[PDB]
Design a protein around this ligand. Structure first.
Ligand SMILES: CNC(=O)[C@H](Nc1ccc2c(c1)C(=O)OC2)c1cc(Cl)cc2[nH]ncc12
Lengths: 39, 156
């Protein structure tokens, strides 16, 4: 069986670690909910 | 049991020890998570039970106790925060500028942050703290890195 445990409040944190890039990808979504790269 | 608004870990004891298989959002008495986390199975919250209400394999979303409540959307310009809840690790806000998934049915936001699979269901937030979608369904790009979609449901 699965169970849930509270992990915190949902709030924006000012002065948070800014990381990650913004890539524009051509993608496809299938009937099983899986994404795939189109090239 | 506990229905206070917030981010929650989705755990299981079917495997060795206690394993975190995903994350979810409690809002307006509704638990929101990704379909591949629970497979639509019932969840436990202390002594109480949470039964699925709505779900969809193609959207990869599922709600418990009521209809999907999250409807805020990414504005297409601003930075967002992934409130990442990693297994065995404390909740942590990570700020990023989302990219784009261009599909045959329109464009979707995308967050390029690499986290364990048990982090799926973590909410993505706007500057107001509103949940604009969930992290955990995406693609692994050429350089082995992970890129997730900003997956948002529909509020009826
Ligand atoms: C490309 N895979 C994913 O998006 C992973 N989640 C996931 C796993 C299984 C299924 C689905 C989704 C789905 O839709 O049906 C079956 C995943 C999530 C996260 Cl948070 C970090 C990850 N790092 N590598 C992979 C991965």
């Amino acid at each position: 069986d699965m169970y849930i445990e509270r992990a915190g409040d949902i709030t924006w944190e000012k002065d948070a670690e800014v990381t990650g890039n913004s890539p524009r990808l051509d993608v496809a979504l299938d009937e099983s909910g899986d994404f795939s790269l189109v090239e | 049991g506990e229905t206070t608004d917030g981010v929650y870990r989705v755990m299981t004891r079917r495997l060795l020890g206690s394993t975190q298989v995903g994350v979810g959002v409690m809002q307006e008495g509704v638990f929101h998570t990704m379909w591949h986390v629970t497979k639509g199975a019932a969840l436990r919250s202390g002594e109480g039970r949470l039964d699925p209400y709505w779900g969809d394999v193609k959207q990869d979303l599922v709600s418990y106790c009521g209809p999907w409540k999250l409807d805020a959307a990414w504005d297409g310009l601003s930075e967002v925060q992934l409130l990442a809840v990693p297994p065995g690790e404390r909740a942590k806000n990570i700020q990023t500028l989302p990219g784009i998934f261009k599909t045959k049915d329109g464009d979707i936001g995308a967050v390029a942050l690499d986290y364990p699979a048990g982090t799926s269901g973590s909410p993505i937030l706007d500057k107001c703290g509103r949940v604009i979608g969930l992290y955990g369904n995406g693609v692994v790009i050429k350089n082995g890195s992970y890129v997730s979609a900003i997956t948002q449901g529909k509020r009826e």
